[PDB]
Design a protein around this ligand. Structure first.
Ligand SMILES: CC/C=C\C/C=C\C/C=C\C/C=C\C/C=C\C/C=C\CCC(=O)O
Ligand SMILES: [Cl-]
Ligand SMILES: [Zn+2]
Ligand SMILES: [Zn+2]
Ligand SMILES: [Zn+2]
Ligand SMILES: [Zn+2]
Ligand SMILES: [Zn+2]
Ligand SMILES: [Zn+2]
Ligand SMILES: [Zn+2]
Ligand SMILES: [Zn+2]
Ligand SMILES: [Zn+2]
Ligand SMILES: [Zn+2]
Ligand SMILES: [Zn+2]
Length: 275
């Protein structure tokens, strides 16, 4: 297949930077306002650092999608480097208008961008981005990349637990929750956060997870990942439970500032991709 394909995503992805570097993925940053100062999310990836900033702030941080003009410049630079097709994969439009900004920036740049809704964010979105970038590097065709991305998307599930509704309420994403200090597990399903279970202690999360795995793990999992906002202890406890049903490596990462702002501390996601 003639041409050079590159992958673009946004900074709501959660991934080791060694993979970004190995695969030449371009990550467009969102922004976050912290007590009247504007930060690029790409500057907020050092472990624990945003958590400290959020915990100390006088008021809740506020996120915003990347500027249309930042996408335009990003795509113009890629075309200048000789890139002939660009695949942009973004967090769900249920969560952010980032994906629209991406499409608008591409229009301005007059760039060959195919803009995809991942349906997720964080490590569930990483599943699609890594596959696309690996295949782009190998010289796969655009159509093969698009089919493979869609296959991954169709076999992915994302479950998120929160320990408070305050961040969801104050950042507005409570508007997606289909149902302030309580434990809740939701599925990110279509355009909504579908409430599955509600409870008082961390046992809300482990009971839910045990009943998920008992029901579903007979279907071979290709990959499973956990992310967290706050301290890692809860995620690591969850990892231990998954490990009893599932033999392979489990990626446990701190989620980024964009997600932390909207979930608050004591949140996690379990993200599963079936074979
Ligand atoms: C803890 C890890 C949780 C990982 C999954 C997160 C999915 C549901 C949470 C809410 C999404 C955040 C909204 C970002 C909006 C960014 C913007 O456009 O300003
Ligand atoms: Cl990773
Ligand atoms: Zn990794
Ligand atoms: Zn590292
Ligand atoms: Zn490059
Ligand atoms: Zn720092
Ligand atoms: Zn094309
Ligand atoms: Zn337009
Ligand atoms: Zn035009
Ligand atoms: Zn993977
Ligand atoms: Zn091929
Ligand atoms: Zn809906
Ligand atoms: Zn904490």
């Amino acid at each position: 297949a003639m041409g050079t394909i590159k992958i673009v995503t946004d900074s709501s992805i959660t991934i080791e930077p060694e993979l970004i570097k190995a695969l030449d993925i371009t990550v467009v940053p969102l922004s976050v306002m912290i007590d009247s100062k504007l930060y690029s999310d790409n500057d907020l990836k050092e472990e624990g650092h945003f958590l400290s900033l959020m915990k100390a702030s006088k008021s809740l941080p506020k996120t915003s999608q990347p500027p249309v003009g930042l996408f335009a410049e990003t795509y113009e630079n890629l075309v200048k480097k000789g890139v002939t097709d660009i695949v942009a994969i973004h967090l769900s439009p249920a969560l952010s208008g980032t994906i629209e900004a991406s499409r608008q920036g591409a229009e301005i740049a007059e760039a060959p961008v195919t803009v995809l809704d991942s349906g997720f964010t964080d490590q569930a979105m990483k599943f699609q981005v890594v596959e696309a970038a690996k295949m782009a590097k190998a010289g796969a065709s655009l159509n093969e990349i698009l089919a493979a991305v869609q296959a991954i998307k169709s076999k992915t599930e994302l479950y998120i637990g929160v320990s408070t509704l305050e961040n969801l309420v104050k950042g507005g994403r409570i508007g997606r929750v289909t149902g302030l200090n309580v434990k809740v597990v939701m599925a990110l399903k279509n355009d909504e956060l579908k409430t599955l279970v509600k409870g008082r202690g961390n046992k809300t999360f482990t009971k839910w997870l045990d009943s998920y795995l008992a029901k579903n793990s007979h279907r071979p999992i290709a990959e499973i990942a956990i992310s967290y906002a706050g301290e890692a202890s809860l995620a690591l406890t969850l990892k231990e439970r998954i490990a009893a049903y599932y033999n392979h490596s489990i990626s446990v990462l701190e989620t980024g500032s964009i997600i932390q702002t909207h979930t608050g501390e004591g949140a996690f996601a379990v993200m599963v991709r079936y074979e």
